[PDB]
Each structure stands twice: as structure tokens, then as C-alpha cells.
Amino acid sequence: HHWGYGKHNGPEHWHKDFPIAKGERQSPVDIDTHTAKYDPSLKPLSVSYDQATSLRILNNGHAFNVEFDDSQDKAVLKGGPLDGTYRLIQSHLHMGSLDGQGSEHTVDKKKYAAELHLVHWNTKYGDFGKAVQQPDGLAVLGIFLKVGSAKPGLQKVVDVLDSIKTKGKSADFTNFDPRGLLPESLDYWTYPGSLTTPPLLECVTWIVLKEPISVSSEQVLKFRKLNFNGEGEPEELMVDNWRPAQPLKNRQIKASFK
Ligand SMILES: [Co+2]
């Protein structure tokens, strides 16, 4: 079978096809605020998404995805713990089957209903494929979702989710603004980690936003109606596609706030 989140192909199995699964820099991790430490050396985080330009949304059988045009520095990430410019290439959503779970990272063991990931690559490598092969090739912004008031920025995509219900489906979508996913505050935690899905490469500088954004019950439920399976196959809801917290292995989690 292909890796996934089921009993026979889930996170606990990954290590057999990807030994790195048991690495020293694996993600996600639980953010222990008693341990996380404020770092003065961190510069202001710069999230320039004004020129952002989305291309399409798609169901790859692993999570809801949206691809961006990364040919130019239209939507980039700089500052914070980053050296240079990191270009936004894609974003995906880790969702739970229940409100009390779904987020990959946890804060003092607390899980959120979901977690969005905005992936950027170090332009110093000229290509996303080459960046993932480097320790500092990726910068992923993590954003926690909790239920409550509806997130205006999510409604547009939420209304067309049926067009990418099953694996392998995709739909053009040029108006997905990642700016509309950001919380008010940009306070965050950083730490060296990896991709949270195979190949689990440890090429990521994680920037997890402290403040979660709100999404309505209805928006969450629409996201939970997506399928892991393909068309014609037995329905398997795309829920609980999150990897649990991995060992911190003495890595240091830095806070951008006092
Ligand atoms: Co992810």
C-alpha cells in the first residue's frame, strides 16, 4: 500500500520505507511553553503575500492542497529565524475527525481542530526540488485552526470543495489569498524540523504561529467531506491526516515574544 494515515499504512509504519522517520529533527513536536525560550537574536518576521498568486486547488489523496506560482518573489517569507528569501509554493490542510484534534503541532499537549501549512523554499537554491535536499531549503508557516466564527478567506475555496472531492482531482483557483489565513498576531515559535509526511526530509525551519484563526463548524465539516480515496472507490473521509508529535531530541524551540 501507499503511505497514509490508516492502521496499516500510518505514521507508525512510515519508518520502514523512510528510516528518517526516526531522525533527530522530525516534525511535528509538542511546543512546551515552559521550555520554549525567547530569542532576542530573531529579527522581525516578514510575510509579504501581497503579490501572491494561487493557481489551483487539488486533492492528492493526502490533504487539501493549493498550489501557488513560485516563478517570482510575489509571495515570500523573510526575517524571523530565516536567512534570505523563501518563496511560497504550496499550502495544505491537516484536519481532524473531531474538533479536539487535527493539528500536528501541539501547545502544552493541546491539539487544535486543524493545522494549515504554507510551504516556502529558499530561493538560494533556484528550485523547490533542490531546496528540499538542504537543511535550510524550506520554511513552513504553521497556523492552528479552532472552530468558532467563520473565516471569510476560507469560504471561497470551501464552496468548491466538491470539485476536488476525490484523489487526483484538481480545480483552477486563482483567487486564493494566503493573507486571509493569517491571524492578527504574528507571534511565533521556531525550531529546526522536517516534512511531516514522507519522505519526511529534515529540510524545514518551522515557524508556528501562536494565535490560532477561527473557522466555522460548517467550513470544517466541508473540509471533512473530502476523500482519501479516488473516484469509484469506497468512501474514506479525509480526516485525521495529521502526524502526532515526534521526539524533540533536545532541539531548542525559540519564541519570538517575551
Ligand atoms: Co503539512
Side-chain angles (χ1 to χ4, degrees), residues 1-17 101 228 236-237 239-242 244:
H1 236 42
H2 193 261
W3 69 264
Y5 297 92
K7 193 67 115 217
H8 301 103
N9 64 353
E12 75 264 31
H13 291 276
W14 298 359
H15 81 103
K16 282 172 284 162
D17 285 299
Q101 68 196 47
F228 275 133
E236 263 155 37
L237 300 175
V239 301
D240 290 320
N241 55 337
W242 48 276

Side-chain angles (χ1 to χ4, degrees), residues 68-197:
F68 298 99
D69 158 37
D70 61 331
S71 62
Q72 283 127 72
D73 284 359
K74 31 138 253 177
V76 312
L77 201 59
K78 315 161 283 337
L82 309 177
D83 256 40
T85 305
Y86 286 74
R87 234 183 260 183
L88 179 58
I89 182 168
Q90 72 99 263
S91 185
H92 46 280
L93 186 70
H94 291 279
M95 171 76 58
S97 56
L98 299 166
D99 286 7
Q101 68 196 47
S103 81
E104 295 211 305
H105 286 92
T106 57
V107 192
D108 290 356
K109 309 244 151 269
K110 192 273 229 68
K111 303 167 150 79
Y112 285 86
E115 197 178 332
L116 261 150
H117 285 157
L118 291 126
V119 184
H120 316 76
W121 55 271
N122 199 327
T123 61
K124 139 178 107 162
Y125 295 125
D127 208 349
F128 170 82
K130 297 149 162 159
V132 294
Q133 315 144 351
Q134 307 295 147
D136 66 343
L138 258 47
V140 181
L141 192 61
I143 302 160
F144 296 127
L145 281 70
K146 66 203 257 260
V147 341
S149 272
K151 191 71 166 168
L154 239 27
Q155 215 30 67
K156 353 121 85 283
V157 345
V158 148
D159 293 315
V160 300
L161 246 27
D162 291 335
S163 74
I164 54 167
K165 215 248 230 101
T166 51
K167 163 226 305 175
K169 296 300 175 143
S170 64
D172 294 330
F173 202 96
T174 55
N175 48 142
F176 178 88
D177 200 357
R179 282 176 50 256
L181 299 171
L182 303 172
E184 293 194 11
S185 167
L186 287 182
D187 282 346
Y188 66 85
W189 289 289
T190 338
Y191 80 93
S194 68
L195 290 171
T196 83
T197 61

